[PDB]
């Protein structure tokens, strides 16, 4: 009865719908499990009505990013602000030493650059001769270049370089070394309302096309051409083509028994083996976010980028200087609990410099992410956990210890002191319709397989879109956006040609 | 009559020395190294200045230390004897504008960040691309600015282009003469400042029979005897005959061979003449002019925040307006037309603050063509050199919390005691710094022709005869090992039954 049925109203599904309408196609649907559109793009509201992108926040690769360029044109035409370039010189903070960024003797940034070059050479033309973890690679580097590194460099470098965990959403001992380093095609552009992006695209097509709260439970290849879709609530539909944009992790459920899993779609016939095997090449990371809202800014706005390094030790240096080899290094490193805010690196965006708002947008990674999200309702504990790093940051930015005012008590004493008024946490790892952040590589994974299998589709009528179905912008908002235009345009041309 | 030798190496630069070292290493005897100058090392030369202070006036750093084979060797030696042979002197650069002062690591200008974007821009422009026309590095920067103007601030559009030019000092060419395709490139790790490149030269020179070395013999001609031999004539009249010859003279010098007039210093008359493949490659590759000037002071009385300092050439706000008002590339190329002499603010200058990295109170400054040629042409007029650089020197002292320099060439003020200048564009056995690319050049051409040789017996080595480490000291070193190894392989067949 419908030309195209799109499953999922994230940026992937919405752009497709937008594209179809744009190409004169009608009788199309967008079945979304949630009670809202946007998918992993969600802008929440907190203290005094401030807004934040608890999901995607930045426009990456602004040199080639087509979605960004589109937003740029709009802004060029109407003069409105839709984004701000917030790249800045990073401020790195160690609990004991304080700031270690741009240091005349540590020069951590410089050796960090050699490290990435080292990673580049390590995997160059060799099909990744036996892959390891990002952790293993950093150790190999330290062992190989010890002769050219000071004691402090061997101590802090490995902790500084782990900011990359916040790009992938995985601890360095879980991250694939081969995929760790990547090149960004230009500066990043912090979106000032990714919801504005969602809204514009969402409005692009006939509203009656949208069907919220439709959890698709099964897709069947109607042995007669058309495809049939059923939403948990009973309703059944049928269309010429279907575009499945559910996240990789959710789609991965289809290869298990008992369609009992929330979100799991029942494919009939099942998804061909080329697809099933693709999932063996790992994926899904866990990038999390915690927003810290203060009454107002009373600290230095030198930079909008800040990272706290996990604790490190001088004994680590000694072990590195003494290891006779890689094996001896591993064993020696083996030193036999309890996680704290100083157990992993943490990335903070000081929103005051870039947007004027007195709040910090912090990024976290697996395994910390699921732990912090698990206790997202317990603000008291959340504060206790991050208080020590929140205090060190304020001390390094010419201010003082944070005052807990989540349960306010107006006091004049808190004149020039930072007053925390609210904490917000993401929930992606616990949300069944997302089950994590976005595709990521565990040592031994090959991302290309999924892209190929996905972009090829189950068959002529069952296509796939989403951040896990494309090479350029993979795992990125613009990637999904473009993958959405891809499927739409393809079906759009086929329909126009039919006669 | 003419002495019979197995292998004759022309030139005692690093290429030639490594060639000889390798031959000996492989047990080859009765060889010879003929060098025109009265010293070995070639473009590797360490001079002495004020109070016995030493400076490399030619090569100074070990580049690409992650894979540089020469550096790895030097490092192995220091690991076993504890002697210091080099020092990793990379640092955060200090950028200075004449009117504005320091503009580095600036929280509002964020020049370094857009510079990274610029390079990525260049990378995407070429690389992995076929049929892409090259242009000047300058034009490339103009294209970036026009294309990203919507995301650049006025001050960024004004200063970024001037900071981007630090790259001129890596090529020894002004941004309008530099091939954009070759501007950017990969650095395999940090750089290590040699604490005596001459120290590297000596070790290699001493690793083979000392009676092999014949300095002060300028070779005038090389002839292949159709009888399977090569005759080599020195200017002093001595004649030699050898089975193989490895020619390592500079590309600019070898170039003289393809021209009439045999009375030019360094020129070698080839018979038969150099094959057309080689001759024509001289059209697709050029020679840059990286130059040096050492400013020696009594003592340090300035900040040692960094060992790397760069002064940007003057810029104007009118430039900005033009980038803002341009309608397209052509439009911009047009408007950029103005109706006067060169000064120290007319181009970027790179200074190495040796006081931090070596503890010596001096500045090692690098300059590029066309400035290099003009500065070397007046290197004997110290007073004139000082007047020319005084303003950038003062501006620097100001930014490093000090005061105007005092001419002391004849309490807390910087006193200039001596000035040393390079001479590579004038030395007939050098005629420039090293191989460089003009827009449209194809260096692969010369490399291929050189590495293939004139014929089985007449081979070539040098910084211009190899891809990996092209233009670098370790590239010349490897090219030397390459030719020696090939020859050893061939002479190996002599002992088969
Ligand atoms: C914390 C975080 C930060 C990020 N930051 C950035 C960033 O700064 N820049 C960037 O470029 N990218 C970022 N990303 C990635 C980016 O958000 C995603 O790549 C992109 O949003 C994926 O889009 P999508 O349209 O494929 O799916 P959307 O989630 O991403 O999901 C597709 C839709 O399918 C629906 N669905 C699932 N199961 C069913 C079912 N059974 N029936 C019906 N509907 C179903 C979902 O509810 C959803 O609406 C971030 C991701 C996270 C988690
Ligand atoms: C100012 C400057 C700075 C530099 N800095 C660096 C740096 O930091 N790092 C780096 O890696 N590289 C640097 N280089 C480049 C490096 O010095 C060269 O790549 C390398 O020294 C070239 O070695 P070569 O053995 O091929 O030739 P050498 O000049 O380079 O020359 C070979 C020899 O041939 C001799 N010769 C010439 N004609 C005749 C003849 N007719 N008869 C007999 N002998 C003859 C010469 O006198 C010479 O000794 C720099 C170069 C310059 C000019």
From Swiss-Prot, chain A:
InterPro entries: Amino_oxidase, FAD/NAD-bd_sf, Flavin_monoamine_oxidase
Cofactor: FAD
Pfam families: Amino_oxidase (PF01593)
EC number(s) recorded for this UniProt protein: 1.5.3.17
UniProt keyword Oxidoreductase, yes or no: yes
GO annotation, cellular component aspect: cytoplasm
Catalytic activity: spermine + O2 + H2O = 3-aminopropanal + spermidine + H2O2; spermidine + O2 + H2O = 3-aminopropanal + putrescine + H2O2; N(1)-acetylspermine + O2 + H2O = 3-acetamidopropanal + spermidine + H2O2; N(1)-acetylspermidine + O2 + H2O = 3-acetamidopropanal + putrescine + H2O2
Segments crossing the lipid bilayer: none
Biological process, per Gene Ontology: pantothenate biosynthetic process; spermine catabolic process
UniProt remark on cofactor binding: Binds 1 FAD per subunit.
Function, in words: Involved in the production of beta-alanine, a precursor of pantothenic acid. Multicopy suppressor of fenpropimorph resistance.
UniProt name for this protein: Polyamine oxidase FMS1
Source organism (scientific name): Saccharomyces cerevisiae (strain ATCC 204508 / S288c) (Baker's yeast)
